[PDB]
Amino acid sequence: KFPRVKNWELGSITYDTLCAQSQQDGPCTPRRCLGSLVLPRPAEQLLSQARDFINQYYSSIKRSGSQAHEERLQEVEAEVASTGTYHLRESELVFGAKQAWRNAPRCVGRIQWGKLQVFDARDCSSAQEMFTYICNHIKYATNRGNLRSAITVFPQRAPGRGDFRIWNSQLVRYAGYRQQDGSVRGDPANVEITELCIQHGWTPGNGRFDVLPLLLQAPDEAPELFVLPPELVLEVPLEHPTLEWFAALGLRWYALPAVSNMLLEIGGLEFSAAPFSGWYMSTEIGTRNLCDPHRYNILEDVAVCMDLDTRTTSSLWKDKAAVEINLAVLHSFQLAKVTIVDHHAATVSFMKHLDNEQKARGGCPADWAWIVPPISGSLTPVFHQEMVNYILSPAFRYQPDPW
Amino acid sequence: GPKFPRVKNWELGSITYDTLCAQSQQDGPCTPRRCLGSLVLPRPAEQLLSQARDFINQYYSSIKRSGSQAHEERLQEVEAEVASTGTYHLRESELVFGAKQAWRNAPRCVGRIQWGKLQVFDARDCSSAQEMFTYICNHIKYATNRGNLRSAITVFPQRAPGRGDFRIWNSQLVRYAGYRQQDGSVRGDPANVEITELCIQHGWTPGNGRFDVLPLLLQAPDEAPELFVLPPELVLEVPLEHPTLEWFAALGLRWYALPAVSNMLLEIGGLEFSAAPFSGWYMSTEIGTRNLCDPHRYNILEDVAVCMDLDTRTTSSLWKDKAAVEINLAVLHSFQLAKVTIVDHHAATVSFMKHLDNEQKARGGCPADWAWIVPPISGSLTPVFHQEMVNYILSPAFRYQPDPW
Numbered sequence: 001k002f003p004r005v006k007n008w009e010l011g012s013i014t015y016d017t018l019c020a021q022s023q024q025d026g027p028c029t030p031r032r033c034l035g036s037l038v039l040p041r042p043a044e045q046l047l048s049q050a051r052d053f054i055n056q057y058y059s060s061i062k063r064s065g066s067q068a069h070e071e072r073l074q075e076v077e078a079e080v081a082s083t084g085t086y087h088l089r090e091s092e093l094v095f096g097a098k099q100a101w102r103n104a105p106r107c108v109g110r111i112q113w114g115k116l117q118v119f120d121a122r123d124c125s126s127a128q129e130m131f132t133y134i135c136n137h138i139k140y141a142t143n144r145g146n147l148r149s150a151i152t153v154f155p156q157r158a159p160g161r162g163d164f165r166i167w168n169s170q171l172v173r174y175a176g177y178r179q180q181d182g183s184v185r186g187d188p189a190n191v192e193i194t195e196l197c198i199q200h201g202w203t204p205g206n207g208r209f210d211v212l213p214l215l216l217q218a219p220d221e222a223p224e225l226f227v228l229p230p231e232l233v234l235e236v237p238l239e240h241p242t243l244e245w246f247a248a249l250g251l252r253w254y255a256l257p258a259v260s261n262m263l264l265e266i267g268g269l270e271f272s273a274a275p276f277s278g279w280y281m282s283t284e285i286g287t288r289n290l291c292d293p294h295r296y297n298i299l300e301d302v303a304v305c306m307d308l309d310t311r312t313t314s315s316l317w318k319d320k321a322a323v324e325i326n327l328a329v330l331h332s333f334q335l336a337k338v339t340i341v342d343h344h345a346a347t348v349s350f351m352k353h354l355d356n357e358q359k360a361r362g363g364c365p366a367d368w369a370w371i372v373p374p375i376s377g378s379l380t381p382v383f384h385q386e387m388v389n390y391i392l393s394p395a396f397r398y399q400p401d402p403w
Numbered sequence: 404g405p406k407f408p409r410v411k412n413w414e415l416g417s418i419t420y421d422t423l424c425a426q427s428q429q430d431g432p433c434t435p436r437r438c439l440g441s442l443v444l445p446r447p448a449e450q451l452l453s454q455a456r457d458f459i460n461q462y463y464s465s466i467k468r469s470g471s472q473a474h475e476e477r478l479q480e481v482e483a484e485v486a487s488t489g490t491y492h493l494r495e496s497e498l499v500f501g502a503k504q505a506w507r508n509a510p511r512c513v514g515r516i517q518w519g520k521l522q523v524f525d526a527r528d529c530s531s532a533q534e535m536f537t538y539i540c541n542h543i544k545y546a547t548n549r550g551n552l553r554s555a556i557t558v559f560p561q562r563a564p565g566r567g568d569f570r571i572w573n574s575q576l577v578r579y580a581g582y583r584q585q586d587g588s589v590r591g592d593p594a595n596v597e598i599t600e601l602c603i604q605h606g607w608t609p610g611n612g613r614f615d616v617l618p619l620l621l622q623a624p625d626e627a628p629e630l631f632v633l634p635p636e637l638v639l640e641v642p643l644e645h646p647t648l649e650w651f652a653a654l655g656l657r658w659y660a661l662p663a664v665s666n667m668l669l670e671i672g673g674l675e676f677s678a679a680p681f682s683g684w685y686m687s688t689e690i691g692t693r694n695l696c697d698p699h700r701y702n703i704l705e706d707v708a709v710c711m712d713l714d715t716r717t718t719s720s721l722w723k724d725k726a727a728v729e730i731n732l733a734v735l736h737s738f739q740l741a742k743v744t745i746v747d748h749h750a751a752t753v754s755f756m757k758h759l760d761n762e763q764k765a766r767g768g769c770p771a772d773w774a775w776i777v778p779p780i781s782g783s784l785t786p787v788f789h790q791e792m793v794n795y796i797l798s799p800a801f802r803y804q805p806d807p808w
């Protein structure tokens with residue numbers, strides 16, 4: 001049996017046959033579905049993953065079964081047999097990084113997957129070098145507001161030593177300062193990384209939007225602190241197209257969403273530092289980062305400004321304030337000429353992506369709870385689309401925090 | 404730590420382990436290779452006895468007589484009855500417990516804080532389609548209660564060896580007609596096109612409004628279904644108006660008060676009640692977001708947006724989100740003014756959080772289908788969005804059953 005995949009808005013049905021290519025198990029069993037969980041509940045092993053990925057590469061260049069292909073498999077085989085590990089060619093790494101993004105079930109922006117600038121930073125040998133590579137990545141990806149997707153790939157994990165790691169979860173993060181009375185100034189998601197920075201000698205600020213330094217770690221060395229040059233970090237002040245008081249709230253967000261703590265696995269090799277970036281979907285800022293109760297949590301503030309009845313849920317003050325906040329993010333990014341996509345256009349493009357993938361691969365792994373936006377869910381076409389979730393490799397994965 | 408699913412709330416940082424899922428007998432659609440959690444419907448002898456025994460064990464625990472002589476005597480009586488007849492029958496109080504437990508077990512229901520408060524009408528004596536109709540009208544009158552709604556279920560005779568089933572053909576007790584037009588479009592509710600055409604094939608004289616209440620197609624064992632028209636005064640409806648947008652009343656939208664599901668199968672201890680309609684009261688997003696705004700339902704978003712003078716030419720105006728919000732407010736405001744029970748999606752999800760905590764203490768978990776529990780607008784503004792959920796099938800259960808035709 002292969003999954004029957006139905007779109008309930010259009011009545012149309014596909015069959016996912018790509019899932020038969022999944023070799024790693026997810027959290028679910030026939031007794032209980034764990035799909036809404038955020039976190040996961042020898043040589044021949046590496047060699048099978050290596051061969052499989054090499055097959056994937058030559059197939060993609062249509063040079064499958066060629067001399068090139070067989071000699072490459074021998075190279076890989078010779079290298080593992082002797083050393084217990086192997087190394088990728090730049091063009092394989094480029095193929096792998098794109099494929100990991102393509103395979104990411106939680107990403108709504110995968111229509112873009114083939115357009116990814118890949119920086120090879122595998123010849124990096126010190127935190128200092130990592131920093132130079134990160135600055136170049138930011139500068140390239142930011143591109144004065146015309147954002148471009150990128151990944152920078154630092155040296156792979158090696159059996160004999162500690163990993164290269166970027167301690168920060170993103171390249172741009174706002175500080176969160178825990179108060180004597182347990183409350184937080186700034187971004188409560190970043191309390192622990194903020195405290196780590198101070199401990200490693202950073203002089204903290206005291207605002208709501210202090211950009212953090214990076215903690216960069218070369219193998220088996222203490223992490224080192226690096227302040228990002230302010231001109232590298234493009235920010236967008238938030239105003240609303242009609243509500244004049246909104247600017248007065250003093251809100252802002254950074255242009256570049258760059259994830260820096262996930263592991264990139266290609267052909268059984270692991271890349272513990274491989275930060276990647278695209279551009280934001282407006283709801284990530286407008287809804288989650290500004291309105292989550294455990295984030296900046298501004299809904300009440302905005303509601304009171306809008307003069308709404310806060311005393312009762314059934315006035316839908318929360319819903320009304322959230323909408324205006326998302327509109328402000330969209331307005332302000334557009335005014336600043338910084339790339340952003342609203343949730344309607346994003347989910348429409350993802351639908352087109354599902355269809356391209358169906359034709360190209362016979363399916364697409366997608367995590368419904370993550371694809372459907374956090375406001376206006378059923379107003380988007382993805383709400384009504386069934387989705388099958390499973391792990392393909394190359395993959396982006398979670399990995400433990402390095403402290 | 405514990406060898407049971409770890410369940411996390413990301414807003415509060417709190418952890419639980421679901422131990423109840425261990426009591427699941429029935430497998431769902433997922434495997435280690437792939438998750439099918441988002442699919443709406445992915446497709447006895449000793450078999451009966453073990454379901455029966457398990458159910459009777461559940462019953463005796465719920466009255467704290469587990470292992471008692473009354474418990475062991477009921478088991479023996481069920482065996483003897485299955486021994487000689489191939490089936491058995493539930494005591495009245497077993498039916499009431501089993502119907503509540505089916506609701507309590509339903510992973511897709513956000514209203515389960517109310518599970519213990521369910522009026523169970525025993526209709527296992529019913530023997531004709533005319534009588535089903537009387538029972539149904541009684542249910543509607545009782546449940547509607549002039550706007551002060553009361554949860555209820557009416558249970559008709561169980562499936563029986565050889566003999567044909569009791570079936571209510573309609574998916575809900577109240578449904579608006581859907582008339583396929585010459586141009587391929589639909590007047591009324593497109594969800595109801597098929598049941599509308601079945602009603603006509605069976606002799607109903609079709610109206611031609613957007614809100615025509617359907618007759619009921621009721622089927623008694625081994626008989627062709629019969630058509631019954633609900634007396635209009637039994638069907639409470641609420642005209643829709645908006646608290647400040649005066650033109651919204653001019654749209655002539657309305658919805659009915661009573662959500663009453665009529666085509667699901669209630670299964671208790673292996674027994675199958677193929678006709679067992681149940682009702683509660685609406686959460687406002689069901690009406691204002693799904694029924695009114697789905698592109699494949701009334702699809703009114705654009706009309707409302709145009710009336711609101713929004714820029715419908717560009718996704719990034721968020722005209723959809725604005726219209727949807729006002730439509731939801733209209734639903735809430737209009738039900739409040741009409742004194743008809745309704746709950747908004749914030750009040751509902753907060754109450755479901757409380758339900759989760761009660762069930763954690765009572766049974767060590769609660770089966771929950773996240774995609775269904777999280778509302779269709781304002782998802783992450785509700786506390787359930789940030790709550791991990793474990794989905795599994797327990798019995799007694801409400802289940803889908805194929806359409807009788």
Ligand code: HEM
Nearest residue numbers: 101104106107108109112149150276277278279280281396
């Ligand atoms: C080009 C514009 C892009 C958009 C609009 C976009 C959109 C998104 C969104 C909205 C999420 C959910 C994020 C959250 O809720 O925190 C996400 C997740 C993700 N996207 Fe993207 N994406 C983009 C590019 C990329 C790129 C370039 C990569 C990697 C090369 C990527 C890989 C991922 C991954 C791995 C996740 C899952 C993160 C996690 O599990 O926490 N995306 N994407």
Ligand code: HEM
Nearest residue numbers: 506509511512513514517554555681682683684685686801
């Ligand atoms: C007390 C008021 C109640 C509220 C607010 C409520 C709320 C809801 C909502 C919002 C849904 C999802 C609806 C949809 O998207 O189609 C639902 C599903 C359901 N509820 Fe309730 N509920 C209530 C009472 C009941 C009662 C009395 C029962 C049965 C005894 C019940 C059993 C169910 C079942 C079985 C489903 C799943 C239907 C399906 O899979 O299609 N609920 N509930």
Ligand SMILES: Cc1cc(N)nc(COC[C@H]2C[C@H](OCc3cc(C)cc(N)n3)CN2)c1
Nearest residue numbers: 038039257259276277278279280281284398
């Ligand atoms: C590339 C990209 C584009 C775009 N528009 N948005 C993104 C946002 O991804 C942010 C990533 C980082 C958080 O990590 C979640 C998380 C948190 C924790 C505490 C543990 C864990 N395993 N995972 C949630 N999603 C990334």
Ligand SMILES: Cc1cc(N)nc(COC[C@H]2C[C@H](OCc3cc(C)cc(N)n3)CN2)c1
Nearest residue numbers: 443444662663664681682683684685686803
């Ligand atoms: C009792 C109750 C209270 C309340 N507030 N809301 C409800 C909503 O239940 C409505 C029921 C009817 C649709 O059935 C879903 C469905 C449709 C189809 C065609 C197939 C399927 N498997 N499932 C959605 N759920 C029920």
Ligand SMILES: C[C@H](O)[C@H](O)[C@H]1CNc2nc(N)[nH]c(=O)c2N1
Nearest residue numbers: 036037038369370788789790791
């Ligand atoms: C528990 C639940 O799965 C969790 O809140 C998820 C839901 N969907 C999400 N979807 C996106 N895009 N990002 C998220 O962080 C989450 N959080």
Ligand SMILES: C[C@H](O)[C@H](O)[C@H]1CNc2nc(N)[nH]c(=O)c2N1
Nearest residue numbers: 383384385386441442443774775
């Ligand atoms: C594909 C997806 O499962 C489908 O659209 C679901 C999503 N969540 C839902 N949630 C509820 N409460 N009701 C529904 O009908 C649906 N539809």
Ligand SMILES: [Zn+2]
Nearest residue numbers: 028033433438
């Ligand atoms: Zn699952």
